[PDB]
Amino acid sequence: PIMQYPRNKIRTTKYTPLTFLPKNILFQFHNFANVYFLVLIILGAFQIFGVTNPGLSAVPLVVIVIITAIKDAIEDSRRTVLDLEVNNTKTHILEGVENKGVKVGDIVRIHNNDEIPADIILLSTSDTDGACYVETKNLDGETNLKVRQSLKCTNTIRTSKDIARTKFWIESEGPHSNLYTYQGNMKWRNLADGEIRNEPITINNVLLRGCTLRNTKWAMGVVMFTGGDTKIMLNSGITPTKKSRISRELNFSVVINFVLLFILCFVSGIANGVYYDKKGRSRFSYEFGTIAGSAATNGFVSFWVAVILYQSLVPISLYISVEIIKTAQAAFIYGDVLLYNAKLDYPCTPKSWNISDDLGQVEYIFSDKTGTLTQNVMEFKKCTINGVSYGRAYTEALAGLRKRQGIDVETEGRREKAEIAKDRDTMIDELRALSGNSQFYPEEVTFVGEVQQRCCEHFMLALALCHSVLVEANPDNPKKLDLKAQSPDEAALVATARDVGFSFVGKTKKGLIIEMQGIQKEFEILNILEFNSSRKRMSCIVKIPGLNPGDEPRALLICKGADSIIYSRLSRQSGSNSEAILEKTALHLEQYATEGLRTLCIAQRELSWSEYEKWNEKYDIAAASLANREDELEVVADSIERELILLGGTAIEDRLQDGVPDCIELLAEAGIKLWVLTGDKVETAINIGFSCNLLNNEMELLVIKTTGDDVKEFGSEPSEIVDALLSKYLKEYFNLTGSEEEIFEAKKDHEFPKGNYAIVIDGDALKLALYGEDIRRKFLLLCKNCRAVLCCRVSPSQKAAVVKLVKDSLDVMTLAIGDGSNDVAMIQSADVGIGIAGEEGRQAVMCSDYAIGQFRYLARLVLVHGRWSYKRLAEMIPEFFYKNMIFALALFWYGIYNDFDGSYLYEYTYMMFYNLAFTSLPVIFLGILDQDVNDTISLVVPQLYRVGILRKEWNQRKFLWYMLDGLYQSIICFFFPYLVYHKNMIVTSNGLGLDHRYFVGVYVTTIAVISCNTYVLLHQYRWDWFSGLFIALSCLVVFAWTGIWSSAIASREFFKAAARIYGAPSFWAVFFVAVLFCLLPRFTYDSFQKFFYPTDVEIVREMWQHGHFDHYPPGYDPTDPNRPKV
Amino acid sequence: NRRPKEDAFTQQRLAAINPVLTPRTVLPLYLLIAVVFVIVGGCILAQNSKVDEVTIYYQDCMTNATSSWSDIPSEHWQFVFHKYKTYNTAPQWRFVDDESDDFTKQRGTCQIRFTTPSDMKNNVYLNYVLEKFAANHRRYVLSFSEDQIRGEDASYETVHDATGINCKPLSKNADGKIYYPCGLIANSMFNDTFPLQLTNVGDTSNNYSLTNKGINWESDKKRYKKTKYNYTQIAPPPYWEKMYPDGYNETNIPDIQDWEEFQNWMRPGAFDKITKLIRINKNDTLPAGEYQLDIGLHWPVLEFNGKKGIYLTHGSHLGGRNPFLGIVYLIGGCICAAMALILLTFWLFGGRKIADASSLSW
Ligand SMILES: *[C@@H]1O[C@H](CO)[C@@H](O[C@@H]2O[C@H](CO)[C@@H](O[C@@H]3O[C@H](CO)[C@@H](O)[C@H](O)[C@@H]3O)[C@H](O)[C@H]2NC(C)=O)[C@H](O)[C@H]1NC(C)=O
Ligand SMILES: Nc1ncnc2c1ncn2[C@@H]1O[C@H](COP(=O)(O)OP(=O)(O)CP(=O)(O)O)[C@@H](O)[C@H]1O
Ligand SMILES: [Mg+2]
């Protein structure tokens, strides 16, 4: 109580199970149609508005509020299990006999390879004075082993038998929400000695919550203090939700419904004001006048009578209808076994259950290349060193298949013929595998002057030295241990140095254990820098000994990066052979990009410690400083790489994620304009765009291709070269599309463009193309008339600004499928948010909207599940405003005949159960279980998707035609009961009298229920048995209710309306013909449409009655690699 | 494992019939709906044209009728006899003023003398028609007591302040007694004492009986039950105090269970035309002849310029002579044939044909 400690769970979910109910209620009444019932129920209690059953007037509100609550509780259920699994799934033993779980003041023992759900303060470990190593993976892009050197003073504890003799937790101040700082200091009192001590606790002594511990054991420490002292709860976790276009254009359809609802109340007000200043009327003699007021205040009260009278025109079950349907459309996305990855055991997981119809109307898909479109397992090596290339492959040398013959296996046998001549002469001094599918590149390396023979051997060691690969104890056959890398391209270079003889056995504390050419050296790596996605660089500064004894041993600098970064970091003038190799080695990588091989480069400068010991300390002072998570590290790590001598580059392969048969063969001949956002280079993305068929033959490849790359700092004020050149051919590529920059005519023109015209903008040319105005609008008009935009979108701001340039400047749906932490800006910025689940759970999946095991499933997710859920919901919503229109205006048309005094036509249990039981379920099941064509035909004809691209189904034009059709059928469902009464008011076979207004209300309701649900049935494709049963059951509940409610005496005036109205043939006479004239003008307009101006999906369904799709198997998946032929 | 249930409902593959509206299927359907509804449009008017009705409005007996027999003017009487043999002959009407009612707004006895050429069949319904009476307003239609309808001796609190339906302007009178049929509806009861017979005149002088039993539904006696009031806490409604001049005795409380004119009036009409049964004769065919109907005028309609009438009918199973259902089923059959004639002559002699798959993206 004094020191203010309440107990709490780890991460909140903003729906606490004790305080869930009052905050859910006030959340329900931000809906204006929902709070419109709080008006008409409190005005229901006052008797002057003439509403019978005011206590039952709450029933179509409380039922909707509870169903929106148990939907919110179910939507809390799969939400809170993320916080419940991290909260208390595990608890350590904490044995204190010698005197994942949360307890303030605990002394917890933490092993290797686990998440720490607390702020532990390190004291000691198995290493020298508490040298802790950590993989901080989900906080930042930290791929190093971040050293956490603990205290060198209190290294006396090993077991929980001496540290559990003291029970104390420390006091700290409020949170600061920053990573690199810790302003806490712990003080302790020694036993039997008067020595005070303040242990200096800095960021080097502690580590945060959401990181991963590696290689250290018995991590001992103290759990944090309660509150919000963990620095991840505010940096990440609070995410803005999104809703669809249809769920955003619904709020204009609700306003048109309320503008009509207040026109009808206004006509009810002024035409009952005109009634009460009529002179000779029956309200003087028999009816004793002045219900509330004398003249116009009597008509003002009758305004608010109509507010309560038109309580079924207000859409109360609209938003629970759109949210049950979007949830069930995503539970079928989840429950599809063809969207299921069997090899990874991973169903398609919607992280957003409310944007399924966005998957039906997308026009731009911004995939990245290597993680998503390709397997990201890299096999081949293809080394290039010192101006000559070492490797032979034919896996993707078929990329240039435009000029070569049909079957070419004679070169594939020459790989194996040179491979069996390669495992013999390399097994002279090596005890690794060196076998079939163990060694990777077939190339005779010099048949082991002659500096080249060392320079290839110097390359493979320095390649093996510049690595982020930790060895792993292989449990089966532990004599041959394997390799693990967070970067799988970086593993293939290391797995192949193990094959040429420059393997490495392990890794010590300061240095490294390495087995080079049989002998087992120990290269000592004193310093290393990290890998960021923006920098494109991984570099080591490993120390080597001097060759002659009695010297100062110099060091090396091996930077591994791309073929465009370190060529901008390379020494131009030199007295060595560092210049003449460049026109050789860049010629090889042009040959090794056009055969689709992922490229790297490795350079090396011969530094001395006279220039290095300052840059080491400049990095070491900036290693525990404030800018350890800022951009000031790269400028520290740039000065010593001003000049470099290039060793060579590597050209590993990356085979596709078998997303060839979708990427145009389903998913861009759908109509969607795809957009690769590689981060790899220009030539290797064109010749991978042909391989994944994204850009095809007969496609104009207009490439932006800035020629010179340099930074400006002074001068160049009267002229401009490096920015003026890429502006001018954006004009010159506007003869292909003969237009200009100035206007956005394309914003109101969504269309798959005639003329192919792919765009291959890259890298620095993109930065200049999105820097300022008049080049963004000029680039984006070229990007509307294209079909494919390609490459070098490195440093994910380029991927995130491009998806936001198209999303904002064109009101259009964007998708941006991806994987890895370089897409959490691309995925979150796009409209839809698909992510790819890899071998481990990555940051893109958790920040996604859907999550599929491969890119292969995007075709079925977009073309089947999305295209359905678009046309399901784009039909459902005009049907929902229809169903309230036919019913709630047929007691407006009764207002003519009671002089708008607002006497109820519908008994009020037909206004209760209309939006709940009588016609709620057909519109729900049209939204959940409607398929225009099958799931196979959705993939056989993917051009059906263009109706969402064109936005041709949901628009406010259709909504007005469904109100006006509902307003027409309201005239039919009232005046057809009216004109069987209007002549002489005797409609019974036995003359006994059904003249009561509730009995005319059954005439009006039963016409308006059956003609509503048959209107839903006539507008659904595929009359299935399940929605067909509940269209029949919703039509036969309006008879079942009056059978059992008008057989109790509790139905006061409505006492036996079953036996009197259904025993009357004039009911059934007008029921069978005022369902005709309700449905006939729409079924005429639909039949005239489906004959003379049919849409594409009637043309496809007319092919479906014929045998145009019987060839295809049920559950056809044309992007599955193992499938039969058509 | 974590693999979804392949049970053909989560797989979205249910047993659908999946209709495609080709002209070889919908043009039979328009032909079927048209040829059904012209038969139903034929069979209804074959039943509806044969319905005979007599509609005599008598609101002007106290002014436009002498003590001797004058004809009803053309506005008030409406005759329908499909055997067009005596359709132009006017009925006649006198008025016996009686000079003693002292109400002078609607008093006396309007004696209406009509002649029917065709014999109406064995169920003859005598209705009273009320035009321009406004029985459908908000405070009016909610003014009664269901517990007084169900014969419960309801107190003042359960008739005045009841939720929803309660008798608000007419709960109790000045001296503290509640009204037993409280409310504007039961107060507004159509008075006019229709006779228990149609006295045949001249040719036969044997009177055609008319019962007031069986006027409402027989099952309506389950909610209208005999009251349990002790005759000292109730009073008649303020417009019933001429038919009960001294309040209620210990013996003259109306049993509303068998008083079916009350049970028809407590069912307020939906529109501005009220037609309620008041006299039935299920037993006897009404022969062709001149009949006299003696209406004790007590219900005033002239202050709201409204009409007050008589509807003598043997309605069909559809009830009454209303040509609406026959005209609509013909219009329903003539539109479904014309829309078939449009969607076939625009389909063959011009239009399009389902011959290609090159109509979507060509
Ligand atoms: C049914 O018949 C009665 C008479 O047969 C109709 O007359 C109603 O008679 C009562 C009492 O005789 C009238 O109340 C009186 O009103 C005057 C003012 O006009 C007032 O000064 C007296 O103190 C007394 O309250 C009543 O006004 C009169 N009805 C009408 C409409 O004027 C009666 O109208 C017939 N209809 C119904 C629905 O009962
Ligand atoms: N571990 C590593 N060491 C050295 N260089 C690396 C590396 N991983 C990637 N690179 C190089 O850095 C460049 C940019 O790396 P980045 O982080 O963008 O990977 P990427 O672009 O291939 C993933 P994506 O395809 O999803 O954009 C790549 O061209 C690659 O050649
Ligand atoms: Mg990736």
Give me the CATH number covering residue A797. Answer: 3.40.50.1000
Q: Are residues A894 and A1036 in the same domain?
A: yes
Q: Are residues A559 and A477 in the same domain?
A: yes
Q: Are residues A795 and A925 in the same domain?
A: no
The answer, yes or no, to whether any atom of ligand 1 lies below 6 A from the CB of B300, is yes
Distant-in-sequence, close-in-space partners of A1005: CB < 8 Å, separation ≥ 6: A887, A906, A910, A914, A918, A1038
How far is A914 from chain B, CA to nearest CA, in Å?
A: 21
Is A368 known as a binding-site position? yes
Q: Which residue in chain A is spatially nearest to B351 when comparing CA positions?
A: A1092
Sequence letter at residue A212: T
Q: Are residues A585 and A538 in the same domain?
A: yes
Closest alpha carbon to A1011 in A869, A890, A875, A871: A890
Query: HSE of A732 in the Cβ direction (CA atoms, 13 Å)?
Result: 9
Residue A1077 covered by a domain? yes
How far is B250 from chain A, CA to nearest CA, in Å?
A: 28
CB contacts, 8 Å: B162 with chain A: none
The answer, yes or no, to whether any atom of ligand 2 lies below 6 A from the CB of A366, is no
Report the run of H or E that residue A506 belongs to, with start and end.
strand A502-506
Alpha-carbon dihedral sign for residues B78, B84, B87, B88:
positive
* Residue A346 DSSP SS3: strand
Q: Count other Cβ atoms within 10 Å, centred on residue A294.
A: 10
Closest alpha carbon to B295 in B129, B157, B178: B129
User: Which of B103, B185, B187 to probe ligand 1 with, by most ligand atoms within 8 A of CB?
Assistant: B103
Residue A329 covered by a domain? no
Closest alpha carbon to A526 in A542, A506, A539: A542
* Residue A549 DSSP SS3: coil
Interface check for B350 against chain A (CB to CB < 8 A): the answer is no
Q: Are residues A803 and A729 in the same domain?
A: yes
Residue A25 covered by a domain? no
CB contacts, 8 Å: A282 with chain B: 132-135, 304, 306
Q: Is B187 exposed, middle or buried (0-12, 13-18, 19+ CB in 10 A)?
A: buried
Q: Are residues A920 and A844 in the same domain?
A: no
Domain of residue B212: give its range.
44-323
The closest residue, in CA terms, to atom 13 on ligand 2 is A536
CA distance to A811, B68, B100, B190, per residue, from B107 (Å) = 78, 17, 9, 14
- Confirm if A887 and A920 have CB atoms less than 8 A apart: no
Sequence letter at residue B196: L
- Confirm if A844 and A823 have CB atoms less than 8 A apart: yes
User: Which of B9, B13, B14, B18 has the most A C-beta neighbours within 10 Å, making it the best mutation to test the interface with A?
Assistant: B18
* Residue A1118 DSSP SS3: coil
User: Which of B242, B276, B295 to probe ligand 1 with, by most ligand atoms within 8 A of CB?
Assistant: B242
Residue A321 covered by a domain? no
CB contacts, 8 Å: B318 with chain A: 980, 987, 989, 1065-1066, 1069
Q: Considering only residues 189 to 218 of chain B, which have any Cβ-Cβ distance to chain A shorter than 8 Å?
A: 215-217
Residue B10 covered by a domain? no
Domain count, chain A: 3
Distant-in-sequence, close-in-space partners of A558: CB < 8 Å, separation ≥ 6: A462, A463, A465, A466, A539, A540, A542, A602, A603, A604, A647
* Residue A338 DSSP SS3: coil
Distant-in-sequence, close-in-space partners of B141: CB < 8 Å, separation ≥ 6: A903, A997, B135, B185, B268
Smallest Cβ distance to B315: which of A991, A999, A1102?
A991
Q: Output the CA B238–ligand 1 centroid distance in Å.
A: 7
User: Among residues A597, A625, A650, which one ends one of the domains?
Assistant: A650
Interface check for B221 against chain A (CB to CB < 8 A): the answer is no
Q: Are residues A582 and A675 in the same domain?
A: no
Q: Is A582 exposed, middle or buried (0-12, 13-18, 19+ CB in 10 A)?
A: middle
Q: What is the resolution of this structure in A?
A: 3.1
Q: Count other Cβ atoms within 10 Å, centred on residue B2.
A: 9
Q: Which residue in chain A is spatially nearest to B225 when comparing CA positions?
A: A1049
Taking phi first (over 0 means left), then psi (-120 to 50 degrees means alpha), and beta for anything else, what does residue A789 get?
Answer: beta
The closest residue, in CA terms, to atom 9 on ligand 1 is B239
According to DSSP, the β-strands at A519-521 and A850-852 are unpaired
Both structure tokens of B8: 């053909």
d(CA A745, CA A1010): 45
- Confirm if B16 and A350 have CB atoms less than 8 A apart: no
Residue A308 covered by a domain? no
According to DSSP, the β-strands at B234-235 and A850-852 are unpaired
Q: Looking at the DSSP assignment, which residues form a beta bridge with residue B113?
A: B92, B292
Distant-in-sequence, close-in-space partners of A6: CB < 8 Å, separation ≥ 6: A226
Q: Count other Cβ atoms within 10 Å, centred on residue B79.
A: 20
Q: Could you tell me the end-to-end alpha-carbon distance of chain A, in angstroms, rounded to an integer?
A: 75
Domain of residue A441: give its range.
383-398+407-605+641-650
Residue B348 covered by a domain? no
Q: Are residues A697 and A646 in the same domain?
A: no
User: Among residues A815, A837, A853, which one ends one of the domains?
Assistant: A853
3-state helix, strand, coil in chain A (%, to 5): 40, 10, 50
According to DSSP, the β-strands at B309-313 and B124-131 are antiparallel
Closest alpha carbon to B150 in B172, B183, B173, B181: B181
Q: Considering only residues 287 to 346 of chain B, which have any Cβ-Cβ distance to chain A shorter than 8 Å?
A: 300, 303-306, 311, 313, 315-325, 328-329, 332, 335-336, 339, 342-343, 346
The answer, yes or no, to whether any atom of ligand 1 lies below 6 A from the CB of A1093, is no
Both structure tokens of A788: 């494919």
Q: Looking at the DSSP assignment, which residues form a beta bridge with residue A213?
A: A134
Residues lining ion ligand 3 (Cβ < 5 A) are A 368, 371, 820
CB contacts, 8 Å: A1049 with chain B: 150, 222-223
Smallest Cβ distance to B361: which of A903, A943, A991?
A943
Q: B328 and A976: CB-CB below 8 Å?
A: yes
Residue B171 covered by a domain? yes
- Confirm if A996 and B268 have CB atoms less than 8 A apart: yes
Q: Which residue in chain B is spatially nearest to A1073 when comparing CA positions?
A: B329
Q: Which residue in chain B is spatially nearest to A930 when comparing CA positions?
A: B12
Domain count, chain B: 1
Is A477 known as a binding-site position? no
Residue A958 covered by a domain? yes
Give the ligand with the smallest distance to the CA of B181: 1
d(CA A966, CA A881): 8
Residue A948 covered by a domain? yes
For chain A, the residues before each gap (C–N > 2.5 Å) are 99, 448
The answer, yes or no, to whether any atom of ligand 1 lies below 6 A from the CB of B189, is yes
CB contacts, 8 Å: B264 with chain A: 993
Interface check for B174 against chain A (CB to CB < 8 A): the answer is no
The answer, yes or no, to whether any atom of ligand 2 lies below 6 A from the CB of A678, is yes
Contacts across the A-B interface (CB distance below 8 Å): 316
Q: A347 and B170: CB-CB below 8 Å?
A: no
Q: Output the CA B268–ligand 1 centroid distance in Å.
A: 20
Any idea of the CA torsion for A252, A257, A259, A261, to the nearest 10 degrees?
A: -160
The closest residue, in CA terms, to atom 5 on ligand 2 is A561
Q: Are residues A661 and A570 in the same domain?
A: no
Q: Are residues A440 and A370 in the same domain?
A: no
Any idea of the CA torsion for A287, A289, A291, A292, to the nearest 10 degrees?
A: 180
- Confirm if B127 and B276 have CB atoms less than 8 A apart: yes
Smallest Cβ distance to A287: which of B55, B137, B215?
B137
Is A871 known as a binding-site position? no
d(CA A138, CA A211): 6
Q: B318 and A989: CB-CB below 8 Å?
A: yes
How far is B300 from chain A, CA to nearest CA, in Å?
A: 9
Catalytic residue IDs of A? 368
Count of positions (residues) in chain B: 362
Residue A988 covered by a domain? yes
d(CA B186, CA B268): 10
Distant-in-sequence, close-in-space partners of A618: CB < 8 Å, separation ≥ 6: A636
d(CA A730, CA A746): 16
Taking phi first (over 0 means left), then psi (-120 to 50 degrees means alpha), and beta for anything else, what does residue A101 get?
Answer: left
CA distance to A987, A1046, A1063, per residue, from A1068 (Å) = 11, 18, 9
Closest alpha carbon to A88 in A8, A174, A31, A26: A8
The answer, yes or no, to whether any atom of ligand 2 lies below 6 A from the CB of A489, is yes
Both structure tokens of A653: 């392969």
Q: Are residues A826 and A691 in the same domain?
A: yes
d(CA A512, CA A385): 24
Q: Are residues A537 and A591 in the same domain?
A: yes
Is A560 known as a binding-site position? yes
Count of positions (residues) in chain A: 1126
Q: Could you tell me the end-to-end alpha-carbon distance of chain B, in angstroms, rounded to an integer?
A: 46
The radius of gyration of chain A's CA atoms, rounded to the nearest angstrom, is 37
Q: Count other Cβ atoms within 10 Å, centred on residue A345.
A: 11
Sheet with B70-71, edge to edge strand ranges: B70-71, B92-96, B109-116, B289-296, B197-200, B208-209
The answer, yes or no, to whether any atom of ligand 2 lies below 6 A from the CB of A560, is yes
Q: Which residue in chain B is spatially nearest to A1102 when comparing CA positions?
A: B20
Is A474 known as a binding-site position? no
Both structure tokens of A990: 């036995």
Is A1120 known as a binding-site position? no
Q: Token pair 């012209």 is at which residue?
A: B38
User: Among residues A853, A887, A903, which one ends one of the domains?
Assistant: A853
**CATH number where A525 lies:** 3.40.1110.10
CB contacts, 8 Å: B332 with chain A: 1073, 1076-1077, 1080
CA distance to A148, A304, B313, per residue, from A1084 (Å) = 77, 39, 40
Smallest Cβ distance to B4: which of A340, A1080, A1096?
A340
Residue B237 covered by a domain? yes
Both structure tokens of A221: 């420490």
